[PDB]
């Protein structure tokens, strides 16, 4: 369970010890970090051979449809499951595994499974979808693997559960949703790519401190398949700089001193703002580079 955003995986050419990190109710709670383990940390779980987190849950083992289970357990003033927190998702999944079945979860869409939404009326802050080529209908279920399988819920599951409880700072960004296949010479084309759109348009450069939080809050809007963030740091003049002829002021390095001499690398933005650099040996990480990623370049 190593999410490829905080660990550099490549041809590896002072001990190392790992740990589990929590980010105060984050959509990626449970990440695995690695550091030197000479320091002092905490240990809580040790492995040997219904109310929950200010919420209430009720499970019924009846085999009924979605509308039918809603009308069934709604008589007791209860609303179907709507996952909005990682701990709630983990508890629902462990309860489903203890019940040994895939139970109902409650939501509905409006326009051809394009705008999904819970029945509570809260802004989307959590996304744990399973696959991209599975969105055949406009409903979802929880599987054994703990993901969100997009299916039709006009069927009979062995049970149900229901619960009770852009211009910004003198710059304009843009998002491109197309399909591309160019996998060569990715260091002398982005400038002329954004310059053809409109004059006075350069690649995204960070000259402030509130733009990071702004783009972070703007990211989790269409993140059904988007999980990584790209940056404009590449091989420039035998160093790790931007594309334009300008020096760097805000360092975006993880730790130590990187010495990447390759023509390109992966400068990634974390979930909370951890500066991350990943040296790549295969080019099979470009999905995720130009098709459904952030290709925003400022105008000023």
């Amino acid at each position: 369970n190593f999410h490829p955003l905080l660990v550099s995986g490549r041809l590896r050419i002072r001990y190392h010890c790992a740990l589990i990190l929590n980010l105060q109710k984050s959509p990626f709670t449970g990440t695995w970090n690695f550091t030197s383990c000479s320091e002092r940390h905490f240990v809580s779980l040790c492995q040997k051979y219904v109310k929950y987190l200010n919420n209430l849950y009720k499970i019924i083992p009846k085999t009924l449809t979605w509308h039918s289970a809603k009308r069934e357990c709604l008589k007791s003033n209860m609303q179907l499951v709507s996952i909005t927190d990682p701990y709630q998702q983990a508890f629902l999944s462990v309860q489903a595994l203890l019940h040994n079945s895939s139970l109902w979860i409650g939501l509905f869409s409006q326009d051809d499974e394009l705008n999904f939404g819970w029945s509570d009326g809260k802004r989307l802050h959590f996304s744990r979808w399973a696959e991209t080529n599975g969105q055949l209908e406009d409903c979802v279920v929880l599987d054994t693997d703990g993901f969100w399988k997009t299916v039709d819920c006009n069927d009979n599951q062995p049970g149900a559960i229901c619960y009770y409880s852009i211009p910004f700072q003198n710059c304009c960004y843009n998002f491109i949703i197309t399909k591309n296949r160019h996998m060569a010479t990715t260091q002398d084309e982005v400038h002329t790519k954004c310059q053809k759109l409109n004059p006075k348009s350069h690649i995204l450069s960070i000259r402030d401190e509130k733009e990071n939080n702004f783009v972070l809050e703007q990211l989790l809007y269409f993140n059904y398949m988007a999980s990584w963030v790209m940056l404009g740091i590449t091989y420039r003049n035998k160093s790790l700089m931007w594309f334009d002829k300008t020096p760097l002021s805000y360092t975006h390095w993880r730790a130590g001193r990187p010495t990447i001499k390759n023509e390109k690398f992966l400068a990634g933005l974390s979930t909370d703002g951890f500066w991350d650099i990943q040296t790549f040996k295969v080019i099979e990480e470009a999905v995720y580079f130009h098709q459904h990623s952030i290709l925003a370049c400022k105008i000023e």
Binding site: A184, T185, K238
Partner: protein, 275 residues
Amino acid sequence: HVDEIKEFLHFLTDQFSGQHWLWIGLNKRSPDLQGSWQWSDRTPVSTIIMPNEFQQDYDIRDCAAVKVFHRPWRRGWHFYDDREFIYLRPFACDTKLELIIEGSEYWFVADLHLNYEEAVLYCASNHSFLATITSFVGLKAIKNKIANISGDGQKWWIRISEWPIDDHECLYMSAKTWLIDLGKPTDCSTKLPFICEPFQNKCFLKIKPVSLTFSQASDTCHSYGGTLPSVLSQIEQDFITSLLPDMEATLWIGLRWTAYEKINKWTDNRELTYS
């Protein structure tokens, strides 16, 4: 040595046609050289490469440079000149890097079409790496083996050079008319097969006592002509102790070796007779 600067001049006169004074790695900027010559990174000067010319402001212009010509034969006869150091020109740099006849065995991959990145990731190992050709006879042998293995239509990811490149430019070669595609790279994101592999006979110099780390102290006196002090006899230790008075208590004797191991050669090509 002088062979290195002659090779650099050959490389700068063969690939380049015009004549212009880019720069040469000769510097007499600091006044503390006391007439000698300095350097910047692990380069003890031992050859005569800088002449002397009288000038009204000879002590101001302190960046030496020679001239490269449009002729293929330039054996030291270069125009010497001296300029200042307040210029501003974009980067042009260098960094320290610290059975087929005439070659080792070459592993040719077949029925497995991978790109350049997948090739350099899969075929390379602790002893394996991208096999580069350094000789023309080896290149002819590679061409014959390619023509006898697959044919003239296939393309192979080959690294072309005249010296073995170190791992510490997506070139390809075809069996037919390799003379035109020697240095013409294309988009290497295609699946194709590939191949994969004073004292007696001893003088001393002293410098400013400015302190610095040992990783950087290996290039403090190496700027001048000489190496770090290596004790070979007790007379050398007596000389060191006799020159110690005007120095501090600490001194960089200058030898590096990993812990829990042995010391080897004193990093200056000197055997151990005693310690």
